[PDB]
Design a protein around this ligand. Structure first.
Ligand SMILES: NC(=O)c1ccc[n+]([C@@H]2O[C@H](COP(=O)([O-])OP(=O)(O)OC[C@H]3O[C@@H](n4cnc5c(N)ncnc54)[C@H](OP(=O)(O)O)[C@@H]3O)[C@@H](O)[C@H]2O)c1
Ligand SMILES: O=C[C@H](O)CO
Length: 316
């Protein structure tokens, strides 16, 4: 299959990227360098991950060494919730550009549909522990995102963790200038997301699957929680194809026409994760993997369930 797919801005996006959430600042620079050395062209970033400076060191060195040209890279970042106010969007984007040491992003996403009160704290709380919302309309945040395109700071704009009604809200925005190119959502065999994916694909929005290995290093994981990497049923499919369980899990969303962004800071796994273009899962393998859906969501943003725009009360 093709290594890239077409976005609605006319640009091509690599279907495999390196994720960077939870990548420690002292390891992520080498992780990104190794990834580029072994062929990765797409890096997934965010201000809220607190490691964009270190990711940027890697990118700049590989550009300087001429291992890769800038035109060949596809760098994604995300607008954090405390910057939804129209007057704060450009500055948030500029800070990410400055840290990553780039003059443009290929894709900039609204990280969550929930706006929070601006300030130093990424999750501003009231005295009772609830997150403090922003009154800024998501449609006004979208207009501010559209300005970044017209100013040359980003080539394309998109959304993340938007449910189908929230996606519909943007597509129906009065005076909509640029459609979302991408919706980035959790997706793995325990949360297959058929309804939201088909909706987005029906609208011409490309879906990026995050946490495709089920984010076993997430901070709130419990010892008894399921593990995709150790599921014997997935291990069997992997063994059959002479591949690893991670390679199956990465190949899975690729054959659903999704982009996928597995995270690792381990050089061997970074290399292994990229070797998924030389085999094919059967339609039977695909349907079997899809059958494992348990609606098991690992990124539920549990501290914000009271927020007006919390996306996961809705069925899809
Ligand atoms: N938009 C959003 O709201 C959102 C939310 C979550 C994630 N994301 C993005 O999606 C990316 C990936 O999701 P994620 O970080 O949650 O989790 P993930 O990619 O599902 O899993 C990462 C974990 O799997 C391990 N791993 C990676 N490759 C492996 C392999 N070949 N064999 C065994 N273990 C392997 C990693 O270990 P080591 O790192 O120690 O090798 C790490 O512990 C994120 O980093 C982020 O860029 C976005
Ligand atoms: O991308 C990271 C998300 O904010 C985790 O909840």
């Amino acid at each position: 299959m093709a290594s890239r797919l077409l976005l609605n801005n006319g640009a091509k996006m690599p279907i495999l990227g390196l994720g960077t959430w939870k990548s420690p600042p002292g390891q992520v620079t080498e992780a990104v360098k190794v990834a580029i050395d072994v062929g990765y062209r797409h890096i997934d970033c965010a201000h809220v991950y607190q490691n964009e400076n270190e990711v940027g060191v890697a990118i700049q060195e590989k550009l300087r060494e001429q291992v890769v040209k800038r035109e060949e890279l596809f760098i994604v970042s995300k607008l954090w919730c405390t910057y939804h106010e129209k007057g704060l969007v450009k500055g948030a984007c500029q800070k990410t550009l400055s840290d990553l040491k780039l003059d443009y992003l290929d894709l900039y996403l609204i990280h969550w549909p929930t706006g929070f009160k601006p300030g130093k704290e990424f999750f501003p709380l009231d005295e009772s522990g609830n997150v403090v919302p922003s009154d800024t309309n998501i449609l006004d945040t979208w207009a501010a995102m559209e300005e970044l395109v017209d100013e040359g700071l980003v080539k394309a704009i998109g959304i993340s963790n938007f449910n189908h009604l929230q996606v519909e809200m943007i597509l129906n925005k009065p005076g909509l200038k640029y459609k979302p190119a991408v919706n980035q959502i959790e997706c793995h065999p325990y949360l297959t997301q058929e309804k939201l994916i088909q909706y987005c694909q029906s609208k011409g929005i490309v879906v990026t699957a995050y946490s495709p290995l089920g984010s076993p290093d997430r901070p709130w994981a419990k010892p008894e929680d399921p593990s995709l990497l150790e599921d014997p049923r997935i291990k069997a499919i992997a063994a059959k194809h002479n591949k690893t369980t991670a390679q199956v899990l990465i190949r899975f969303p690729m054959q659903r026409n999704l982009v996928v962004i597995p995270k690792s800071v381990t050089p061997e796994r970074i290399a292994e994760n990229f070797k998924v273009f030389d085999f094919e899962l059967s339609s039977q393998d695909m349907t079997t993997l899809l059958s494992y859906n348990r609606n098991w969501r690992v990124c539920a943003l549990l501290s914000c369930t009271s927020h007006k725009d919390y996306p996961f009360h809705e069925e899809f």
